[PDB]
């Protein structure tokens, strides 16, 4: 009957749909590889989808996926076993090298632009008409690392103009240079800003930005990467 028809029909629809859904999520990081980077033998039942090309605003070109994949940065890792499936140990300083939970991707070295073609993110000093409207203004508060030692002082807030949001705290270190600190990895308190991931001694290692009034996708990744990695690698310095 009709009902039987409809339901049998639907289970068929649903199956080609999953198939669709699945092949679309195969647009990045495919095809699969062996730990040595050579193409892996068994890529699953699903074919790579036919490529699609994105037209990036503000004449920043195009992006076609799937496409040629490459890390475009050295990886300082060495195998710890003779068969597949085991960890790869950092061969240096994982933090300094950017592997592990400290990994960063070679994103473009251009900043994210808003709908108008202006830099999406800005130090608040250069963002005409922005102010802390609620909560504790961090600016001026010392910054404490997981080792409970003071590392610097907030000397500005880098805001996201189109979404009117605090993205990073800029921090002034003992030598007078500054670093950005992701907003999402710090606790703003009444008399201090506490950073659990990094011990005071690692703040200097936080990668620097080439221009003082801009951050690029590459530098966001290298920073967030680094600060995140502290959680696992600063661990010996963290007390509480």
């Amino acid at each position: 009957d009709l009902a039987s028809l409809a339901i049998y029909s639907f289970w068929i629809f649903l199956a080609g749909l999953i198939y669709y859904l699945q092949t679309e999520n195969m647009r990045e990081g495919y095809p699969l590889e062996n730990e040595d980077g050579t193409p892996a033998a068994n890529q699953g039942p699903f074919p790579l989808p036919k490529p699609k090309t994105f037209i990036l605003p503000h004449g920043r070109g195009t992006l076609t996926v799937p496409g040629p994949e490459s890390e475009d940065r050295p990886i300082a890792l060495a195998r710890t076993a003779v068969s597949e499936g085991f960890p790869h140990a950092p061969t240096g300083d994982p933090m300094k090298d950017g592997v592990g939970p400290a990994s960063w991707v070679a994103r473009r070295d251009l900043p994210e632009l808003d709908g108008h073609g202006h830099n999406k993110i800005k130090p608040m000093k250069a963002a005409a008409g922005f102010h802390v409207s609620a909560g504790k203004n961090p600016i001026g508060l010392p910054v404490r690392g997981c080792d409970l030692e003071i590392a610097g002082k907030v000397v500005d807030i880098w805001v996201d103009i189109p979404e009117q949001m605090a993205r990073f705290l800029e921090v002034e270190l003992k030598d007078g240079s500054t670093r950005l600190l992701p907003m999402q990895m710090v606790k703003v308190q009444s008399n201090r800003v506490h950073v659990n991931a990094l011990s005071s001694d690692l703040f200097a290692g936080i990668p620097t930005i080439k221009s003082p009034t801009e951050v690029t996708l590459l530098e966001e990744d290298k920073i967030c990467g680094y600060v995140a990695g502290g959680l696992m690698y600063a661990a010996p310095k963290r007390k509480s």
């Binding site: 990081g29 605003p57 592997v99 592990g100 400290a102």
Partner: protein, 281 residues
Amino acid sequence: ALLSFERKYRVPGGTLVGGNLFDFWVGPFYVGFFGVATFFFAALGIILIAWSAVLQGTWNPQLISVYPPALEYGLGGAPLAKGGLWQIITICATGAFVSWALREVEICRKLGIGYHIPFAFAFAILAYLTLVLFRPVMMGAWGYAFPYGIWTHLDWVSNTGYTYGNFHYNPAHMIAISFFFTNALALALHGALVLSAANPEKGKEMRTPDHQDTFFRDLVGYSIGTFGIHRLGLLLSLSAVFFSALCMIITGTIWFDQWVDWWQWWVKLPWWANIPGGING
């Protein structure tokens, strides 16, 4: 075996239990100590379930059903064929679930991300525990739990419901449903919003988040934004399930009568209780 960008992430560490012992992968999958735990609990449980199936004398999945002990057994142990098997199976499920959560924690650490996912999952686990542990205890027999079978479980739902009248009147049930509906609404929108920006009209440039915020203010005069909608989603979801637990944990424990009748409180407020006319006067 690895995604084109996976290797630099596959470093040692992050394990909660047992150091480097189980710190490794099997194909795409991460094992970890709890990798093993869940496997063991999952193996055992499925076994017991098959064992129930022979005692039942059917291999047909639409028929197979593992029932809790009958009320006469209260919160004591029961013979295998008479409810023990369900009790173990329930222990094993719990073991599986919790372990699966703790593995999520272990992966979280290795990758250096937040614990929001293990977190949210614990709500699912807590809803399940409400229906097979917290409620039966409080009620006083494993027998109030739902049976493990594809349709028999739908039956428990239907019977348990109709016991208190039309269950629609359970007030926390009303609230819990509003989230389920609301969440789906919001998942519908979020998905649609991002896709429409990433896949504009033919030959046009990828839109921007600014267009996303604009599209919605134009539509309903407000936009929660990108960080917002993700906060929103997590919340509606967790809330739906939170109220779902609540509506059950109260049902049969502190309220055992017809749910519709509980509304008489409102209608019988002394200031309008006796005023004639309307529906109730």
